[PDB]
């Protein structure tokens, strides 16, 4: 590993994304860029790839595909394969689908053949960009040279964005919400998150879009990727699971939503409302309790604790109530078992989870794939870092779309729920840079 000092007026987000653009273009390779605590980690090129589907597990290295059957828990199959990748290299990266979370609630039988559950790769090279420096791990001459060329020429200026109308409802989100409300009224479950896709009728430039949206979002994690034919970027508002090498596990549920970004005077009264509002507080309290019960399934007895309770978390177009829950990983458990315990996130599924996740199969467009799943970074020393995938744009084939959803409870109204998905799309819709 060598290192280069960070140029002076240059934001590490703009640099890391420019690198992803220019460098990975020039060599025409897949990549995933992951922002985690002031480090922008660019995992460049695919040394080897684990593909976990509902009906099969594949490992692809140097043109060769090893195919395997698998049974049991998806985290056990994924875990074994990723553990092997991590004998070779210090970190692996990828994404986990919403669908990875349904086995635990008895829904494996609903997945169609070949439903993606996870894609995790080891990179050929990593470039880490922070406030202070750029570190290079296994960069070849051809990469070092292209980085040199990028530093020489400087980051492009981001052009003006092109706008999208989100106010149509082609997938019947309003009709769907009303069905959920009826089902809640008849006692079927307490809460479900439904969503809607919005088509983007032009191709976007993913790295420049990433840069622009990043100046207006304050995420816990963020990501920009091009992998196996998917392009995606997003600003993640919450950690679904982090596991540290010392066995400490964290989850960070948010529940309760006000508008933000409307100017200081408006955003203060929305905050004060938020923090003292019976409806927001009850739903936060309920999620805290569910996620504590989930974490207790993988926790050393008595180690599960709320360490930050019900405080305001600022997230760009919205502010939320957030808590942080902590535990020690039980020696009989492992990081993948921790992720399955907390997946899908409560925040983007429902309560009780078996009934809420099942309502999503009936009342949302499925599979969800990346949306409400996680983007992940895993370490040879036993680390896992899993960001909840929301506020993301995707491109697959010739289709480019956004997706956003909202929690439906007994008192919910379709019109207001639709407006909530607008506010949520707003965290990205003003910042799309056309290709
Ligand atoms: C992060 C916490 C919240 O945000 C969301 C919840 C469910 C879906 C979304 C979405 O953007 O689709 C969302 O931003 C919340 O509404 O409680």
UniProtKB/Swiss-Prot annotation:
It catalyses: chorismate = isochorismate; isochorismate = salicylate + pyruvate; chorismate = prephenate. Mg(2+) binds at residues 283, 417, 420. Pathway: Siderophore biosynthesis; mycobactin biosynthesis. Its cofactor is Mg(2+). It holds the Pfam family Chorismate_bind. Signal peptide: none annotated. Disulfide bonds: none annotated. Keywords: Isomerase, Lyase, Magnesium, Metal-binding. The active site is at residue 238. This is Salicylate synthase. Substrate binds at residues 256-257, 371, 391, 405-407, 424.
């Amino acid at each position: 590993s060598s290192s280069i000092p960070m140029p002076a007026g240059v934001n590490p987000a703009d640099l890391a994304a420019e690198l992803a653009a220019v460098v990975t273009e020039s060599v025409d390779e897949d990549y995933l860029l992951y922002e985690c605590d002031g480090q922008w980690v660019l995992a460049a090129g695919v040394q080897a790839m684990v593909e976990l589907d509902s009906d099969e597990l594949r490992v692809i290295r140097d043109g060769v595909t090893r195919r395997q059957q698998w049974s049991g828990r998806p985290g056990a199959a994924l875990g074994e394969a990723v553990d092997r990748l991590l004998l070779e290299t210090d970190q692996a990266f990828g994404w986990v689908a919403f669908e990875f979370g349904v086995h635990r609630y008895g829904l494996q039988q609903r997945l169609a053949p070949h439903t993606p559950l996870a894609r995790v790769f080891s990179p050929r090279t990593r470039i880490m960009v922070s406030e202070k420096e750029i570190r290079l791990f296994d960069a070849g001459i051809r990469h070092r040279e292209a980085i040199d060329r990028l530093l020489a020429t400087g980051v492009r200026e981001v052009p003006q964005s092109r706008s999208v109308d989100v106010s149509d409802d082609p997938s019947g989100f309003r009709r769907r919400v009303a069905v959920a409300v009826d089902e809640i009224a008849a006692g079927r479950y307490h809460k479900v998150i439904l969503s809607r896709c919005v088509e983007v009728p032009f191709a976007i430039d993913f790295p420049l879009t990433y840069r622009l949206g990043r100046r207006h979002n304050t995420p816990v994690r963020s990501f920009l990727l091009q992998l196996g034919g998917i392009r995606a970027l997003g600003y993640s508002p919450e950690l679904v699971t982090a596991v540290r090498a010392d066995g400490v596990v964290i989850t960070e549920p948010l529940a309760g939503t006000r508008a933000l970004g409307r100017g200081p005077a408006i955003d203060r009264l929305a905050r004060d409302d938020l923090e003292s509002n019976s409806k927001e507080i009850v739903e936060h309290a309920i999620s805290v309790r569910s996620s504590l019960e989930e974490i207790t399934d993988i926790a050393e007895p008595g180690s599960a604790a709320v360490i930050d309770f019900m405080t305001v978390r600022e997230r760009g177009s919205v502010q939320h109530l957030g808590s942080t829950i902590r535990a020690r990983l039980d020696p009989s458990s492992d990081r993948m078992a921790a992720l399955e315990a907390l997946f899908p996130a409560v925040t983007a599924s429902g309560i009780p989870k078996a009934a809420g996740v099942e309502a999503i199969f009936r009342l949302d467009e499925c599979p969800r794939g990346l949306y409400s799943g996680a983007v992940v970074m895993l370490s040879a020393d036993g680390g896992l870092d899993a960001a909840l995938t929301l506020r993301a744009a995707y491109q697959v084939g010739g289709r480019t779309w956004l997706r956003a959803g909202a929690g439906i409870i007994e008192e919910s109204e379709p019109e207001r729920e639709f407006e909530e998905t607008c506010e949520k799309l707003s965290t990205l819709t003003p910042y799309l840079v056309a290709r």
